[PDB]
Every structure is written in structure tokens, then in C-alpha cells.
Amino acid sequence: MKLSARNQLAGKVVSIKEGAVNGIVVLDIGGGNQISSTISMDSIRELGLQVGSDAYAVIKATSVMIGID
Amino acid sequence: MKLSARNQLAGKVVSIKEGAVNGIVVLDIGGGNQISSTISMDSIRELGLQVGSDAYAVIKATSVMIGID
Amino acid sequence: MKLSARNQLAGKVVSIKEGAVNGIVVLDIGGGNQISSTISMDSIRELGLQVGSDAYAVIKATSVMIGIDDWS
Amino acid sequence: MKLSARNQLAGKVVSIKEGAVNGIVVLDIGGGNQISSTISMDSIRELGLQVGSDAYAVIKATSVMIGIDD
Amino acid sequence: MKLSARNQLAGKVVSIKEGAVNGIVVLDIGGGNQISSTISMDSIRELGLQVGSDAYAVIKATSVMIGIDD
Amino acid sequence: MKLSARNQLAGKVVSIKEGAVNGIVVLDIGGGNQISSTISMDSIRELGLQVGSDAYAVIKATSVMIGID
Q1: Taking chain D, what is the end-to-end CA distance rounded to the nearest angstrom?
Q2: According to the UniProt entry, where is the signal peptide (chain C) (predicted)?
Q3: C-alpha closest to that of D27 among D15, D19, D17
Q4: I want to staple B58 with a disulfide (CB 3.0 to 4.6 A). Which of A28, A65, C30, D27 is the partner?
Q5: Is A67's CB within 8 Å of F1's CB?
Q6: Does A67 touch chain F (CB under 8 A)?
Q7: Strand order in E7-18's β-sheet?
Q8: End-to-end distance of chain A based on CA atoms, in angstroms?
Q9: How many CB atoms lie within 10 A of CB F19?
Q10: Judging by beta carbons within 10 Å of its beta carbon (0-12, 13-18, 19+), is residue C51 exposed, middle or buried?
Q11: Which residues of D touch E3 (CB under 8 A)?
């Protein structure tokens, strides 16, 4: 399905640290960037996620803060 | 200050399209990826930021969803 | 793309409140319930959304709070 | 309290998945719709939530995305 | 309504910066702390918010990040 | 780093509830107020957080709702 979210970044799953209700999925999206996503275990199974899966990090623009040194 | 957020991606501001109270800053984070950030104009003033500034897109892991094809 | 968000509620657009950069879209999801979503006007244009369009309200489980009535 | 969040959908809890710190409450809100909510275990205790309790899924308008079929 | 969000901080509104669809309200929550909230102008109308209003800053635990000094 | 987030409230950690992937850190921020924050266990290690650490609750303005009686 097509999503309204402005951040939709392709990457590959390089870690999945499983837990009770939630889990943390890490995507390498190129450029030496990794995005970590905390989602429910139910979703990790439902989408089939495994180390090496192709995926997208989806982030709403209002979820992004800016920082500087 | 050092932040708990799992996602802290360094990038350069490639555009900043202003609006009334809010504003949308776009960061090139390398690998040809861009992050769009909606933050209040007060913060855009306070942090300085100009097209070409070094900055960070900071995203909490709980803000990221995963999608697949 | 298929999404990890546990809440993906089918509905029809019943209103679109335009603004300069943003807008408020309301979806009738059946059962007499409506969802409101604040998204960028750019996404509403790019997505084709119009009053009467079929769409989905997509919500992450961590974004939802639970409430109970004042007498519980 | 009366809450600023734009989405407040009434329903009955059909499951509560307990975990270490967090848990998932599922609401039937009628019309064949269910909302899943990930909240802390402390709130599920304090709110008295049990299977069959009447409750509300509360969602900010800014937390909702729109999707369409491609 | 009774709320699951653990952060429910009583305070008084000290300013309201109005905008097109949304607006920013600032609350004094005691201890010398101020919390800023961006919510739709529709909710600021519906709750009647004014400088001097009693209100609550409501924040979900999953929205709060932790920071420390270098 | 200097952050765009409107809410940065100084406090001391009063408990830390450990979990699988996440944990809940509570801050005394003065005025008898406590902020509860659910963040990843990796962030809790990395920041060194212990009961009694000085820290900040950092919250985006768009994450905050208002309620009245």
C-alpha cells in the first residue's frame, strides 16, 4: 500500500533483537547509516522479518527532530 | 547533550522550506537518502541551521515502522 | 509495501481540511467511527486523496493510548 | 479529564498480552475493526483493564498516517 | 476520561501561539518546568484553553527520550 | 548534541525497571513530578544510567497532548 509518510528508506535487516512483546529491528540503509525500529513481535513474524530481509524504514516527518553540535 | 534515541543520523541540510509556525528541513544523510523533519520555527531559529549546515536527524526507535514489498 | 503497523483501518474520506502545508483528513471506517489524520498537503496531493476515496488510517500500536470512563 | 486527542474510539478489550515492561491491549471498536495498543504494564494494572472491560483507544491526529492501494 | 499515559502533569497555560491548523500551548507544571505542546487549533477551541487555564500535559512513556550531559 | 526538542526537563533517575529489549526510566523533575520514559535497554546501558543519575526528559512538542477538567 502507498503511505503518506515522507520518510520511506530502503534497507536490509542486519539485526533483530527479540523480546516479549516488542523487538528491535535494525536496517542498514546504505551510507553507513542504520535505522533501529522498535516494533511488536507480532509484526516481526507477520512480515516475515529475518536477518537479511529487504525492508523499508517508515518515519513520519513529525517524528524527526534536528540536532547540531 | 547525548541522547538515548537509537537513530542519530548525521547529514547536511539540503533544503529548508519555511512555513508559518512550523518548517520542513531535509537532510542528505549519505547513500543518496533524504530525511524530512517537521519542527517548530522557534527551534529552527534557535539551532541556527542553514542550507548546508551540518546537523543530525534524531528519531526514537519507537517512531519507526517497518515495511516490505 | 506491506506495513508493520498493527492498526490499518479501511475507510472512506469524508472531509479534507486544507491548509498551507498541512491538512486534516477524516476517514469513515464503519461502525459509526471516524479517524482524523494530520498529514502534509504534499502527501495528500501525491496520494490522490479526495472526498470519497478509499483509504486506510495507519497507526502504530505504540501511538495508541487506552482510556476508561471517569467512573472506573 | 477531557483530552485534546482527536481520536477517542470506544470498545471492549478482547485480549491483553502481558510482557516484562509493556503489553498489548486489543480493542473491538465495532464494525469489524480492532485497534491494538502497546502500553506499559503499570497502566494496564492501574486502569483495572481485564478482558471484557469497556475502554477507549486514544490517538493523536498527528500519529495517524493515510494509505491507499496502489 | 481516565488515561493510560503515565505523564499527566498539572499546570497552568502561560501562552498560546495560534496558527492555521495547529497551535503551540505552553504549560507551567511546577518545579520551574515548562512543557510545550503542539496540538490542533480545533482542540484548543474545544477545550477552551486560555492563558490562566488549568490543564494537564499528557505524554506517553514511549514518547519520552532520556538525555545526559557530555 | 544540541537538540530541537522543545521539552528538556532536568531530573534524577528514581527507578529503572529492566526488561527484554526496553525498560522504563522514571525521573524526579522537581515539583513532585515524575516522568516515565520507555526506551531501549541498549540506550540504558550506553548512557550509563543508574538509579540516581542526572538526566533529562526530552519530549517533542507534537508528542504532548493537553487535558482539562
Answers
A1: 41
A2: none
A3: D15
A4: A65
A5: yes
A6: yes
A7: D2-3, F65-68, E54-59, E7-18, E22-28, E34-40
A8: 38
A9: 20
A10: exposed
A11: 1, 3, 58
Task: Determine whether the interchain pair D70/A22 forms a contact, defined as Cβ–Cβ distance below 8 Å.
Answer: no
Residue spans per domain, chain F: 7-60
Calpha distance E14→E37 (Å, rounded): 12
Residues C47, C57: Cα–Cα separation, whole Å: 13
* D8 contacts on C by Cβ (under 8 Å): 67
The residue type found at D54 is D
Chain F: give the shortest CA distance to residue D54, in Å.
21
C positions 13-32 inside 8 Å of E (CB) = 17, 19-20, 22-24
Q: Is B68 exposed, middle or buried (0-12, 13-18, 19+ CB in 10 A)?
A: middle
* Beta carbons of E68 and E57 less than 8 angstroms apart: no
Resolution of the coordinates in A? 2.7
Please check whether the domain covering F7-60 is classified as CATH 3.30.200.210. no
Best CA proximity match to C8, nearest among D34, F64, B50, F31: D34
Q: Please, how many CA atoms are within 13 Å of residue D70, restricted to the half-sphere of its CB? A: 7
One-letter amino acid of F12: K
Which of chain A's residues have a Cβ under 8 Å away from the Cβ of C6? 40, 42-43
Residues of D in contact with F20 (CB under 8 A): 19-21
- The cell numbers describing B17, all together, are 522550506
Which overall architecture, per CATH, does domain E7-59 show? Answer: Beta Barrel (2.40)
- Structure determined by: X-ray
CA-nearest residue to F53 within chain E is: E68
Query: Could you count the other beta carbons within 10 Å of the beta carbon of residue D35?
Result: 27
